[PDB]
Amino acid sequence: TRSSRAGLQFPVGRVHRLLRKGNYSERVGAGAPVYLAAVLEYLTAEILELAGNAARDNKKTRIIPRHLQLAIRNDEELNKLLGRVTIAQGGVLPNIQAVLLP
């Protein structure tokens, strides 16, 4: 398969089918879905890495959307990426203002 041929995990063939179906352009270059599946793999890997690290920090072995919320909102660059985005079942950051404390 092309995923095995690119050494990647995401299905490059499905991405190629969706680029053909999604009408982004008429012709789709061959390296484009390879590159795109690589970028998806890196983003998914880093976000699941942060989520699993937060899950270990909360001693949970099953990833729930709370850990995804905490992982995305604790990375300021991912927060810059996903500031508009709402995660469902997420909650918010533990954030107490310093004027409130005694």
């Binding site: 976000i47 072995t61 099953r62 990833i63």
Partner: peptide
């Protein structure tokens, strides 16, 4: 997503709602 999870966190679970998120 599960394959990438086993690549990163090999013995960690993920809920169906978190899978919908992803």
């Amino acid at each position: 997503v599960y394959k990438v999870l086993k690549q990163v966190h090999p013995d960690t679970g993920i809920s169906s709602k978190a899978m919908g998120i992803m």
